[PDB]
Amino acid sequence: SGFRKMAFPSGKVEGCMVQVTCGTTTLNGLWLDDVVYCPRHVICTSEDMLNPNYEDLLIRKSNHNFLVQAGNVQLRVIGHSMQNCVLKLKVDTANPKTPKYKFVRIQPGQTFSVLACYNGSPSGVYQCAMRPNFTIKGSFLNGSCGSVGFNIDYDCVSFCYMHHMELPTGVHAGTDLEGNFYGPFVDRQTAQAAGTDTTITVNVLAWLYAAVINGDRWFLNRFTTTLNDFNLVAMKYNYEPLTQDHVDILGPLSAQTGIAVLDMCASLKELLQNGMNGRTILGSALLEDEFTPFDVVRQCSGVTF
Amino acid sequence: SGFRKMAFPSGKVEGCMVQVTCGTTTLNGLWLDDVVYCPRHVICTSEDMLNPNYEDLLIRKSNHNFLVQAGNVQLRVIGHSMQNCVLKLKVDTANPKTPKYKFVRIQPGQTFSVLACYNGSPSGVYQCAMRPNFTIKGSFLNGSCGSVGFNIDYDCVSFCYMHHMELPTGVHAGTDLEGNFYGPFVDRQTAQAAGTDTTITVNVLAWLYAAVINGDRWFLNRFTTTLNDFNLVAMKYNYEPLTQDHVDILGPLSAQTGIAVLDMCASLKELLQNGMNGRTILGSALLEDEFTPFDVVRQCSGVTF
Ligand SMILES: [Cl-]
Ligand SMILES: [Cl-]
Ligand SMILES: [Cl-]
Ligand SMILES: [Cl-]
Ligand SMILES: [Cl-]
Ligand SMILES: [Cl-]
Ligand SMILES: [Cl-]
Ligand SMILES: [Cl-]
């Protein structure tokens, strides 16, 4: 029993974290086989921050301008190349702690673990979701850039996120490990701002199923709804559309608990129209949207209480 | 910016987790140097569960009755001894991944990271607090027993918790790594139940300071209070007493933000008397009590926004 914001065990990633310095700028890198991946903004200076031309800034660098340190071991850079918004630093040594890994891009509403790092040294691990507006509500301070987000399946690390910047509302933007940004954000100082966000409806339903699995039914009701009628109420409360595929993804949780997905939608509609009236669900006074259906199945018993 | 339930990086602990089997019972062990620590209830059978005499059950065992597996390597048990509610299995091999470690017992209201494990294999990492009633609101399924809780200071793992059982309300009880239970709980099937719990007042204030550091002031007010008058309101809402030492521990956060501790107590009093009125703090609709003053300083900038 119980239900927590649970991250994947971080060890396989901790063994990949290194420090990257270019002049006076230090941030984190990811050392996999003989390549170190880091944010290309490591080559920006205070003057280059409003309108850097990275192609122009990088052609002016040499291998020896990059200092890479794995703990107290310097790694010699023997090549460099720009990969969209990531730099690939080829080093003379393959990382012997390289896990089985993949580079996967995630969808808005999917979750991942973040290993927050400073000067190549892991500080903490937490769970995050990719918001519908392609930001993440991370926890990151100056120097966290190059920290990565990941999921683990068996022994294989799926890297999905590299941290690049903080937006003015204090939420975070970054790239996949091929250096392609999530969302309309760029790695320079601009007027960029997170657009309007919405609530991840399929996740809120997953989390209501978690609550039922965990033996709490208070918010359930005798009503059902159509998908179209649910979406009409959803839209009104700034919730993402729920799709038939979302209904099918909630199938297994629906089968475990015996609560039809559209009956759980009727429950959610009532919670949106009435609020919780001083009650909690799984220890929250808000409708939680950063647990996926997979997260709930991963964490909860395969037997309902 | 941002504020998450942040665990310590788990790798140093993952390299210590092993599987322990005695007959048909399998749970997790902690392999440090040449000792494996696990819950003594691994020696209980279905018949021995209401009234086991563990001294009586253990004298009937031999070294060879214990099967210990570190991944796919069997560890040979060359000695065994009971340490309060933990078994110490001496093995023929020192764990080469043993980190620098200590066994520390924590106080009610202190936080720690949990590495939830099944069959010696880490599943996830989350943050927990020791509740005032000496339970933890964990996330644990059948077979999680022997999972450990820890804090990390520099390179040194302070183990503080080993998981032993789930109570009827779905909260969790266990021991320190010397096998001494937190709280009035025992490792057998009895009528035991978590007693009444309270809110960890010093933590709620810490978390209000976190909110201010993170640039949110909405809940602040022009009032102050005495410690005695605050405690009179606290008691009424099932909050722990706030002590002068708690005031002194909140000193550095008070100095960073320029908000006197008793002025933050006046803020908390108002939040207890009025509620939040549909507003949130750091993304919660409840007063969060599982962040310590240390957790806030560890996570938040040393510069207020
Ligand atoms: Cl949590
Ligand atoms: Cl060197
Ligand atoms: Cl923004
Ligand atoms: Cl909500
Ligand atoms: Cl969180
Ligand atoms: Cl073997
Ligand atoms: Cl209980
Ligand atoms: Cl509250």
UniProtKB/Swiss-Prot annotation, chains A, B:
Changing residue 145 to A: Complete loss of 3C-like proteinase nsp5 cleavage. It comes from the Viruses. Inhibited by pyridone-containing alpha-ketoamides compounds 13a and 13b. In turn, alpha-ketoamide 13b (tert-butyl (1-((S)-1-(((S)-4-(benzylamino)-3,4-dioxo-1-((S)-2-oxopyrrolidin-3-yl)butan-2-yl)amino)-3-cyclopropyl-1-oxopropan-2-yl)-2-oxo-1,2-dihydropyridin-3-yl)carbamate) inhibits SARS-CoV-2 replication in human lung cells. Inhibited ex vivo by michael acceptor inhibitor N3. Inhibited ex vivo by compound 11a and 11b. There is a cross-link at residues 5, 90 (Glycyl lysine isopeptide (Lys-Gly) (interchain with G-Cter in ubiquitin)). The active site is at 41 (for 3cl-pro activity), 145 (nucleophile). Residues 1-305 form the Peptidase C30 domain. Residues 1-305 are cytoplasmic. Coiled coil: none annotated. Changing residue 132 to H: In strain: Omicron/BA.1, Omicron/BA.2, Omicron/BA.2.12.1, Omicron/BA.2.75, Omicron/BA.4, Omicron/BA.5, Omicron/BQ.1.1, Omicron/XBB.1.5, Omicron/EG.5.1. It catalyses: TSAVLQ-|-SGFRK-NH2 and SGVTFQ-|-GKFKK the two peptides corresponding to the two self-cleavage sites of the SARS 3C-like proteinase are the two most reactive peptide substrates. The enzyme exhibits a strong preference for substrates containing Gln at P1 position and Leu at P2 position. 3CL-PRO exists as monomer and homodimer. Only the homodimer shows catalytic activity. Interacts with host FBXO22; this interaction promotes the proteasomal degradation of nsp5. Cleaves the C-terminus of replicase polyprotein at 11 sites. Recognizes substrates containing the core sequence [ILMVF]-Q-|-[SGACN]. Cleaves and inactivates human TRMT1, preventing tRNA guanine(26)-dimethylation of tRNAs. May cleave human NLRP1 in lung epithelial cells, thereby activating the NLRP1 inflammasome pathway. May cleave human GSDMD, triggering alternative GSDME-mediated epithelial cell death upon activation of the NLRP1 inflammasome, which may enhance the release interleukins 1B, 6, 16 and 18. Also able to bind an ADP-ribose-1''-phosphate (ADRP). This is 3C-like proteinase nsp5. It comes from Severe acute respiratory syndrome coronavirus 2. The chain holds residues 3264 to 3568 of 7096 of the full protein.
